[PDB]
Structure formats: structure tokens, C-alpha cells
Amino acid sequence: GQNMRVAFMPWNGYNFEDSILVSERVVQEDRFTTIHIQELACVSRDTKL
Amino acid sequence: AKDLRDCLLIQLSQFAKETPWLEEARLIISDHLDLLANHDFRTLMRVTRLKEEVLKEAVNLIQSLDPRPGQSIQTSEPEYVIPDVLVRKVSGRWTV
Prior knowledge:
This is part of a larger assembly, with chains A and B. Chain A is built from one helix and no strands. By secondary structure, chain A is low in regular secondary structure. Chain A is elongated and about 70 Å long. By secondary structure, chain B is an all-alpha fold. Chain A: This is DNA-directed RNA polymerase subunit beta. Chain A: Belongs to the RNA polymerase beta chain family.
């Protein structure tokens, strides 16, 4: 995880029950960015032809 | 639904008019298709006033003509094979 500066504040209804506001700083600072690995495979399957 | 030459004409119509030798290719496909089939470069060049290496450019263009386009649409092709005898022969002379 990362240690984020957080505040306890209603903000125009952007945090109604469980909704969270994030900074443009954090995304600009490339925090929390996630990297994934997808895979592909292929065969030949020799046929009678 | 005709000869690939007609399909080639349709592709050329779809293709941009800026392609070199498009008119020459059209003229050859019109009524000089037999000359192209027999690869009679001498007679074809004499009749059509074909320039040197211009036939090469036309052949290269005809290479990108998507012959048998319906074959590519039928991408699906299940494999068919039967096991029958085995010749694995691991370490030589294996009783596969």
C-alpha cells in the first residue's frame, strides 16, 4: 500500500455513503498503478490433410 | 460470383486509383487474361506495349488481390487425425 494524506470531510455529496475522492496528484504521481500479465498459446494440430 | 479477374476488378475499384499500372492491369484483365495465364511475357508486352519491370509491378499488385477471399472467411477448420500406430521410438527401438 501507500500512505495517502486523507481527510474526514463531506464534499458536495461526492462521499455520500462509501464513495471516495482521489487527487489528480496521486494519479499524476503514478501511485497505485497496477501491472498485469496476460497469456496466449497456440498449437498446430496436424491433420490428415 | 465470377472469375477472380472480375473479383480483381472489384478489388481495384475498392483500391485507390493512385495505384501504379492500375489501367494496365485492367487492360490486361479485360481481354489479355490468356496472355497472363500462359506467362507469355513477350506477346503480352508486344500487344499491350508493356514497359520493362512494369509487369513486375502489376504482378506485385495482383499478389495483393485477396484470391479466394471466402477461404479466409472460413477461418474455422477442426483438426482430424486418428492415433493408429505409434512410432515415438524413445531412446531408439521403443515398443510404441
